[PDB]
Amino acid sequence: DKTVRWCAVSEHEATKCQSFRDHMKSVIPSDGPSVACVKKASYLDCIRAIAANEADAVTLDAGLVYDAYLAPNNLKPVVAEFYGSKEDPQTFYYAVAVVKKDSGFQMNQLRGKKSCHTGLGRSAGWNIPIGLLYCDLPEPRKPLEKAVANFFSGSCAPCADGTDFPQLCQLCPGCGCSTLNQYFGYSGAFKCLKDGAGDVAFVKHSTIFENLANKADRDQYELLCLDNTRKPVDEYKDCHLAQVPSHTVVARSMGGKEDLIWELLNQAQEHFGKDKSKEFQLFSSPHGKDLLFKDSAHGFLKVPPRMDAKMYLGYEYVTAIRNLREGTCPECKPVKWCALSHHERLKCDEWSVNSVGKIECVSAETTEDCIAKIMNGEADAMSLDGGFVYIAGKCGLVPVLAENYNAGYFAVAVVKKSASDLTWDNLKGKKSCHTAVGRTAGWNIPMGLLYNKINHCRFDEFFSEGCAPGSKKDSSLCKLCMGSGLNLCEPNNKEGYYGYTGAFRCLVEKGDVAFVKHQTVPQNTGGKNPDPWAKNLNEKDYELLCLDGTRKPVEEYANCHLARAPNHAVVTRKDKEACVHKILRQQQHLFGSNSETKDLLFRDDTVCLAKLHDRNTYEKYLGEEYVKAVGNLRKCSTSSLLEACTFRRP
Ligand SMILES: [Ti+4]
Ligand SMILES: [Ti+4]
């Protein structure tokens, strides 16, 4: 059987689940998914059932998505309910802090102000802001209401205990826990700000737009960002306290059956979803409200498979809720560097002990895994090719420092001098060598420029064949690669044509054109590289293709390049930007220009780690032309972390 066991947490839900079961039988072929129904006492029991292999799937709110993720449950998000509309599916809501224009304070300045909350215990209006402010609250932090009552000078916090903590009901005497209190709920809490009662209102991104029809009025309001700046109210996507998913189907991390659940839910929406007019309807029940799914849902979206619960809830939300559950507070710490190999780890380990604690080490198996650990706080920093910076940036990370070599390197197209046919003007049908797909020199620049000329990104149909590590194994752009077994065409060291040098090797041995950097050929010719394939080459036998259509010697790169490359950059979270900026400059003035293999942690031709000033965004660091180009190349991108990040922020 291909059966999905759906977990119900009430008798009304089990009835609906059984009806679900029975109607699906009429629409799904016998080799298709079917439904079984397991009734438990509560969401937490469902979670346990699923983790114990007595059930398979349940739909949860964000706080339970969190519980479900914790050991020993280890469930993950697999399907999202969406709202509003088929054309523009709404999956998340943003908790925001709204304030009046020119009220003159930042998030790190909330102590002593007046606050408006939608209601005690509510997500946007209470658990998130109080969770993120947790360690700012005065001691003792239990009971929590007491500590909040001594942080804000006065508040309106519906359903708080005003009898014990009157300060909390100062702007709404009684703390009425119903719509009889004028300041209850979303519009209530917004109204509390608008009427001048409060200085800040903890609400959802949409609250302001639902209460103020004219832009003229909304301009009188702003949002507090976590980075202690303000932004306009329609910029909540870049200025929110937390991004939060509405309603999320979860499942075991290993053991699924993710695939079956999607095939089930997807077919269910297609026959029984919103507006499908059958006697059974997936998103209502005669038996009561919100049974197994929210009645307001318009359907389901598949959660990208790379996504785990920390990633899906997001860093700010997880921080907030950990604080509320654990309640632990500090009194820069150590920068946790991310290693990608045994050899990278060994350099990092001896860096750690040499830094005397200031640096610690964490490893992952791929760059993307490392980036994900930085997103979620398992790690803090690593250095990355510009192509990975773009991905890190789309995932909410920022560049802090650039690696310097001497404006950065030159991206160049190398060819054999002998074959004097080749020109930039027509490389159609030629054999190409790339460092890896998605890297600056190897891909993003050259194929960026190439995209403008052919108006598609199926480059495996432009070139005859090639080696471009990270391509699909059966692609013509894996035909020239030299890795054996599972390593063929892999973007790592077990593929000998991977990377700057690898791509040049590829040209020497098999290719017609190699996309690399200006100092690749010089460093691998004239006997400098002793390996048999490079030992006897001299740079005079190689030429560069200029945008002109002409060709020039290798050392002539300054007048014969494809474009200026952004340098490789250190990235981190905005919340560690300052600590990473400090420690690394303090570490490089100790261990800089004053690896045991090649290019470990930082490129080997790096002299110093440079300040960025105004370029501390991926867009500003890479430049707009680079970003536009990568945008065009995504149409053919295979990056599953990028797919996860963009699911959350299109
Ligand atoms: Ti709420
Ligand atoms: Ti690079």
Side-chain angles (χ1 to χ4, degrees), residues 1-332 334-357 359-650:
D1 68 26
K2 301 227 288 135
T3 154
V4 176
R5 292 163 305 169
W6 201 279
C7 197
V9 295
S10 75
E11 281 180 340
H12 291 322
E13 283 202 342
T15 299
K16 184 164 174 189
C17 182
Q18 286 163 343
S19 204
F20 183 31
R21 186 228 288 120
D22 294 347
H23 285 88
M24 283 300 104
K25 292 203 144 299
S26 323
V27 316
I28 275 157
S30 54
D31 67 35
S34 67
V35 180
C37 304
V38 184
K39 210 248 142 186
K40 300 281 168 191
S42 81
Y43 290 116
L44 228 51
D45 284 322
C46 273
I47 286 166
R48 258 115 61 172
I50 291 165
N53 206 15
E54 313 192 348
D56 292 333
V58 73
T59 321
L60 295 180
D61 269 348
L64 293 148
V65 169
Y66 182 67
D67 298 329
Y69 147 72
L70 297 164
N73 303 310
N74 316 122
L75 311 185
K76 64 177 173 174
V78 298
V79 175
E81 282 178 29
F82 76 90
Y83 302 87
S85 190
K86 225 150 226 306
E87 338 310 305
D88 184 41
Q90 304 295 302
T91 289
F92 299 85
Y93 69 90
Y94 296 85
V96 296
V98 188
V99 292
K100 300 246 214 178
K101 179 60 79 61
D102 313 319
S103 54
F105 64 87
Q106 299 296 347
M107 188 100 42
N108 54 7
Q109 288 184 303
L110 280 174
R111 189 172 63 195
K113 305 289 175 298
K114 298 180 286 155
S115 64
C116 311
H117 313 270
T118 59
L120 187 137
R122 292 202 181 187
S123 260
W126 184 265
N127 306 329
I128 292 160
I130 302 309
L132 296 169
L133 294 163
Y134 187 83
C135 283
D136 287 356
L137 306 172
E139 284 168 314
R141 286 179 269 244
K142 291 157 257 203
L144 180 66
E145 295 191 56
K146 195 173 192 178
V148 176
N150 283 287
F151 180 83
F152 292 115
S153 51
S155 278
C156 170
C159 333
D161 179 2
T163 309
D164 294 305
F165 312 112
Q167 301 100 325
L168 284 180
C169 308
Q170 162 182 327
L171 324 194
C172 55
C175 282
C177 190
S178 75
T179 56
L180 298 158
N181 170 5
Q182 64 166 355
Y183 295 153
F184 183 69
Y186 284 110
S187 60
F190 179 75
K191 180 185 200 298
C192 161
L193 168 64
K194 172 162 141 292
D195 297 357
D199 299 307
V200 57
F202 298 109
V203 298
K204 291 183 325 103
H205 70 288
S206 57
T207 311
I208 196 169
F209 299 95
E210 291 159 344
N211 291 277
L212 288 181
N214 274 0
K215 210 232 172 206
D217 302 313
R218 291 186 233 111
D219 289 351
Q220 297 306 115
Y221 296 83
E222 295 184 296
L223 302 176
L224 303 179
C225 331
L226 285 177
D227 72 352
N228 304 308
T229 67
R230 301 180 165 201
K231 282 180 158 80
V233 297
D234 58 353
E235 292 191 45
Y236 48 90
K237 271 155 174 194
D238 301 292
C239 189
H240 55 259
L241 310 189
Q243 176 171 356
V244 188
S246 299
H247 220 224
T248 304
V249 184
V250 308
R252 267 175 257 120
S253 285
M254 278 187 50
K257 318 134 154 175
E258 314 114 14
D259 281 342
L260 224 58
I261 303 172
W262 171 247
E263 194 195 337
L264 176 78
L265 284 183
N266 192 38
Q267 285 168 41
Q269 66 185 324
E270 179 57 24
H271 291 104
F272 298 118
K274 167 72 177 156
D275 304 306
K276 288 292 175 282
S277 308
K278 314 284 169 59
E279 75 142 1
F280 178 74
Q281 314 159 21
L282 198 59
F283 302 121
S284 60
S285 186
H287 297 98
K289 211 144 162 324
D290 294 329
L291 301 183
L292 315 179
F293 312 104
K294 275 185 200 327
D295 275 7
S296 58
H298 286 31
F300 299 119
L301 288 176
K302 194 182 157 80
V303 173
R306 175 70 186 79
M307 187 97 69
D308 76 86
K310 287 208 285 189
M311 194 181 301
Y312 194 63
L313 305 162
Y315 180 71
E316 325 64 39
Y317 182 86
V318 175
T319 303
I321 196 178
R322 288 244 270 179
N323 286 342
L324 286 189
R325 268 133 196 275
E326 292 167 17
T328 312
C329 294
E331 278 156 326
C332 242
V335 168
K336 292 189 294 309
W337 200 271
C338 210
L340 290 184
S341 61
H342 201 62
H343 301 95
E344 270 210 344
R345 182 49 181 272
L346 281 179
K347 173 149 117 150
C348 187
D349 280 325
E350 73 175 313
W351 183 16
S352 186
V353 73
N354 280 322
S355 69
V356 178
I359 300 294
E360 296 181 325
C361 301
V362 138
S363 61
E365 284 171 300
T366 71
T367 292
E368 294 196 345
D369 293 341
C370 259
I371 288 171
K373 292 198 175 200
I374 294 176
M375 290 163 64
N376 71 24
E378 286 175 18
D380 301 325
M382 73 191 290
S383 190
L384 295 170
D385 159 61
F388 277 130
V389 174
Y390 174 90
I391 291 175
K394 287 287 188 191
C395 290
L397 301 183
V398 289
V400 285
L401 295 169
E403 298 176 340
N404 274 7
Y405 66 85
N406 185 291
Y409 70 96
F410 292 101
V412 295
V414 194
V415 298
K416 183 81 196 295
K417 191 165 172 189
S418 68
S420 55
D421 329 73
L422 301 172
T423 73
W424 181 242
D425 287 4
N426 212 356
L427 297 178
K428 178 144 129 47
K430 304 290 135 54
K431 300 180 158 104
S432 60
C433 297
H434 309 260
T435 55
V437 45
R439 313 296 174 84
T440 300
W443 194 264
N444 294 338
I445 296 164
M447 302 306 97
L449 293 167
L450 191 44
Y451 183 90
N452 297 329
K453 295 169 142 206
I454 61 173
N455 312 339
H456 63 87
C457 46
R458 301 108 53 189
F459 299 108
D460 56 330
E461 298 175 321
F462 179 80
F463 301 112
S464 48
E465 60 182 349
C467 182
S471 300
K472 330 165 306 168
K473 303 296 164 161
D474 65 340
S475 175
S476 76
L477 295 182
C478 287
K479 259 69 143 105
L480 301 183
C481 301
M482 71 167 271
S484 30
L486 286 182
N487 306 300
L488 181 69
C489 206
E490 213 58 55
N492 66 65
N493 45 331
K494 276 116 230 157
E495 168 59 59
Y497 291 175
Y498 163 73
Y500 298 112
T501 304
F504 172 61
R505 180 179 180 172
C506 172
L507 174 58
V508 168
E509 298 169 327
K510 305 194 189 161
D512 298 317
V513 62
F515 303 110
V516 291
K517 40 169 214 211
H518 69 277
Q519 73 257 62
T520 297
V521 173
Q523 284 164 5
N524 293 286
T525 54
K528 279 169 225 165
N529 188 343
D531 288 342
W533 71 269
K535 180 162 153 157
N536 202 47
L537 311 168
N538 52 69
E539 67 178 72
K540 299 151 145 189
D541 292 318
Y542 298 98
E543 292 194 316
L544 301 183
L545 308 176
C546 328
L547 300 171
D548 276 325
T550 73
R551 328 203 324 174
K552 290 193 206 302
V554 149
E555 283 221 348
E556 212 104 79
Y557 56 81
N559 291 261
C560 190
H561 59 261
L562 299 183
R564 201 104 205 195
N567 284 336
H568 280 201
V570 179
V571 307
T572 191
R573 294 177 311 275
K574 283 201 195 160
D575 82 320
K576 269 187 186 267
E577 169 169 39
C579 271
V580 168
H581 201 284
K582 187 210 244 169
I583 295 277
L584 301 188
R585 278 186 23 175
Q586 180 261 296
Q587 285 281 307
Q588 85 175 329
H589 204 64
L590 292 167
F591 310 112
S593 303
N594 165 225
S595 43
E596 258 173 35
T597 307
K598 42 210 312 287
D599 286 13
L600 275 47
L601 291 51
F602 316 76
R603 294 227 305 223
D604 275 34
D605 24 324
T606 312
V607 301
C608 73
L609 296 168
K611 299 165 57 48
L612 297 179
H613 300 117
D614 195 51
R615 310 202 305 145
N616 51 359
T617 302
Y618 84 89
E619 291 127 297
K620 292 188 284 165
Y621 184 70
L622 300 172
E624 61 153 309
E625 197 74 323
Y626 190 103
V627 168
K628 286 179 61 213
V630 175
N632 285 351
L633 297 174
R634 299 221 306 208
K635 305 182 205 291
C636 309
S637 153
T638 67
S639 179
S640 74
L641 169 68
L642 176 67
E643 191 197 7
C645 294
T646 50
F647 185 84
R648 306 215 321 139
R649 210 207 173 296

